[PDB]
Design a protein around this nucleic acid. Structure first.
Ligand SMILES: [Zn+2]
Length: 666
RNA sequence: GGACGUACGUCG
RNA sequence: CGACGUACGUCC
């Protein structure tokens, strides 16, 4: 209530009737600005004619919040305020929704699918297209697809009333720009992709913005890595033994990847072992009986090496016992879903050194200095103020549980309560109830950002130009810190240049707000034009579909799974097997997180039906009334019967063959 | 199942 | 400048 001067002036160009890229770093400010803009838009229409606005919410929580906010704001107006989503798109057709409501709030993908298949022949039905967080307008984004559908009708000479763009954001972003020239080029490209002429930033009332902006102070706490790593040495010896054992089956193991000398525990060995896996998945022998065992042994060795590398990576950022508990949980999970002579030997090799690793993990002298520095900087702040509701940001999801267990099992800090929050990638109610009780948790160990904190700790975290600003984080301003822990000087340089890029944009927008909107347009129109030109020139024609009958086999077992002639495409994205010989080739299991996506309902998970393979094949759903399995070519190999050469595809779009549509008749 | 984005890393 | 790997997140 009582719109302040800063948020009244920030919405002036949008109310004047211009497409704006309003940039407000507040949470409530953007919401109130959007509400005032929708009010001034739906109130400036004459008698008879009625307006129609759409608020493009990107996330389900943001959509559910904005729908309730709009419903509570426009209650004494007679304005229909509804909303579409992934669960409501089934019934209540979107055409009748838009033709009977004045304020629609839908996650874009719905409008993209509508504009694509059958619905919304043109966006001229809308009169306002408020894009929440327009900075996400990038390559192949749903916002970008909506803007492409808009720019096609705009530049194609189609006479029609085009809707306005009121794109709200908190940071226009810089991307990979090096200088102010490249920053201005990127900002102009974003303006052309959004078809706007004003970038509204608060200039007159700076004190009202600085009162609540949530601008904390940075504090770099770079620490050196561990010197005496006995756990790392033992795991490296185990990895060397595993590689020496795997070399006995595949002679040219070093000649399968073009990667140079690599070190254990780095991100390079992971790519090297993944390349070795993808080069061993095409191993073919004329016996076709020994290959099914050779490829299986190689897959098991590669999986063990990948788990060892993941344990070595977790050990560098967490306790020495957490990386061992990870391997113990992995071995416990794998010791039930099949046990052959190779997996038993690997388990025995691991158990021969588990006893030795337990002593080194329990030894408190081998504690990494990074967690010591973290506890040291946490205690000095919680002693100064025993009310700091801090938030911790890490990179890996497996490190969230590690930091939670570290906070739990530490006698130095007792006043801390774990606030583990990873994301679905968990569920929506689990994500909502954990953020609700945040006024009795003390620390929130999250991995990716209504969170008004006063202390942030980026424990080995790096990202875009800014990974700290919270769009929906208005709250209040009373002094906060942005502590950054790291061990790789590279990251420290990244964070040193990001704060520069910030000022870069601060000068770029200031240089762009001086140009008279005329020339601005005279440029951005040419830019978007060129863009459409590239969209028309760059178009790979559909290659001749290979009309043979090849056989899709297992990924790790090389068993005859199914035939390509039995593959049916449901909706150009899902592929099922319409056969009777394939139903006995897989086993079903209950799904951990069942859900539905606009056409199906995830019921079960289908795995390989072999003796000790148990490879993840795909899901099993019910299309409309009948239940079919949806497989993923990613977990499949493609062997031809004519030539015999095998191929590995990651996505279905890369697979060029006779895509027979799914006929419900058979 | 699929699409999309961001970060890191390897390659020619 | 292109492909590719992984991690994380979002949506349908
Ligand atoms: Zn198999």
């Amino acid at each position: 209530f009582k719109p302040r001067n800063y948020q009244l002036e920030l919405a002036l160009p949008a109310m004047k009737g211009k497409n704006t890229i309003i940039c407000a770093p507040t949470g409530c400010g953007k919401t109130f600005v959007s509400l005032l803009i929708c009010e001034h838009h739906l109130k400036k229409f004459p008698q008879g004619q009625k307006g129609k606005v759409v608020f493009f919410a990107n996330q389900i929580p943001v959509y559910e919040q904005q729908k309730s906010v709009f419903s509570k704001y426009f209650e004494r107006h007679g304005y229909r305020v509804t909303g579409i989503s992934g669960a409501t798109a089934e019934n209540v057709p979107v055409e009748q929704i838009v033709e009977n409501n004045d304020i629609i709030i839908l996650t874009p993908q719905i409008l993209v699918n509508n504009l694509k298949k059958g619905t919304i022949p043109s966006l001229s039905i809308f009169t306002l297209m408020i894009f929440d967080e327009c900075h996400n307008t990038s390559k192949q984004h749903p916002y970008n697809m909506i803007m492409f559908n808009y720019l096609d009708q705009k530049l194609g000479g189609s006479s029609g009333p085009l809707p306005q763009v009121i794109g709200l954001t908190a940071s226009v972003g810089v991307g990979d720009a090096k200088n102010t020239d490249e920053a201005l080029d990127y900002i102009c490209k974003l303006c052309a992709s959004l078809d706007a002429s004003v970038i509204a930033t608060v200039k007159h009332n700076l004190e009202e913005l600085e009162q609540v902006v949530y601008k904390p102070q940075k504090f770099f706490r770079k620490v050196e890595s561990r010197i005496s790593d006995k756990f790392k040495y033992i795991i490296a010896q185990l990895m060397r033994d595993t590689e020496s054992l795997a070399k006995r089956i595949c002679k040219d193991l070093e000649n399968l990847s073009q990667i140079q000398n690599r070190e254990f525990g780095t991100q390079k060995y992971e790519q090297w072992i993944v390349t070795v896996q993808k080069a061993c998945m095409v191993f073919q022998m004329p016996d076709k009986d020994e290959e099914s065992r050779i490829c299986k042994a190689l897959f098991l060795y590669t999986s063990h090496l990948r788990k060892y590398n993941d344990a070595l990576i977790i050990s560098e950022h967490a306790r020495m016992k957490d990386a061992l508990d990870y391997l113990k949980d992995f071995f416990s999970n794998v010791r039930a879903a099949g046990f052959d002579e190779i997996e038993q030997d690997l388990t025995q090799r691991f158990e021969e050194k588990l006893q030795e690793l337990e002593s080194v993990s329990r030894d408190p002298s081998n504690e990494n200095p990074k967690l010591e520095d973290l506890c040291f900087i946490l205690q000095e702040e919680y002693h100064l103020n025993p009310e700091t509701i801090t938030i911790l940001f890490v990179k890996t999801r497996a490190l969230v549980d590690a930091l939670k267990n570290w906070i739990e099992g530490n006698p130095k800090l007792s006043f801390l309560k774990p606030g583990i929050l990873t994301g679905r990638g968990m569920t929506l109610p689990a994500q909502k109830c954990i953020l609700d009780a945040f006024k009795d948790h003390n620390i929130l160990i999250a991995t990716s950002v209504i969170a008004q904190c006063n202390l942030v700790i980026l424990y080995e975290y790096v990202g875009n130009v800014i990974k700290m600003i919270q769009t929906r984080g208005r709250g209040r301003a009373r002094g906060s810190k942005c502590f950054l822990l790291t061990s790789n000087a590279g990251v420290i340089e990244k964070e040193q240049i990001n704060m520069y890029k910030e000022k870069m944009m601060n000068d770029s927008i200031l240089r762009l707000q001086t140009w008279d909107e005329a020339v601005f347009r005279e440029k951005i129109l040419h830019i978007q034009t060129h863009e459409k030109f590239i969209r028309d020139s760059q178009e790979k024609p559909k290659p001749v579909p290979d009309k043979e009958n090849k056989k899709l086999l297992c990924r790790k077992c090389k068993a005859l799974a199914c035939y390509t002639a039995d593959v049916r495409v449901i909706e150009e994205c899902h592929y099922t097997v319409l056969g009777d010989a394939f139903k006995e080739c897989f086993v079903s299991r209950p799904h951990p997180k069942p859900k539905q996506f606009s056409s199906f309902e995830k019921r079960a998970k289908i795995f390989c039906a072999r003796q000790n393979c148990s490879h993840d094949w795909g899901i099993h759903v019910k299309y409309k009334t009948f239940e079919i399995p949806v497989i993923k070519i990613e977990s499949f190999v493609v062997e031809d019967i004519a030539t015999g050469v095998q191929t590995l595809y990651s996505k279905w779009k890369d697979f060029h063959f006779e895509k027979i549509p799914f006929d419900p008749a058979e």
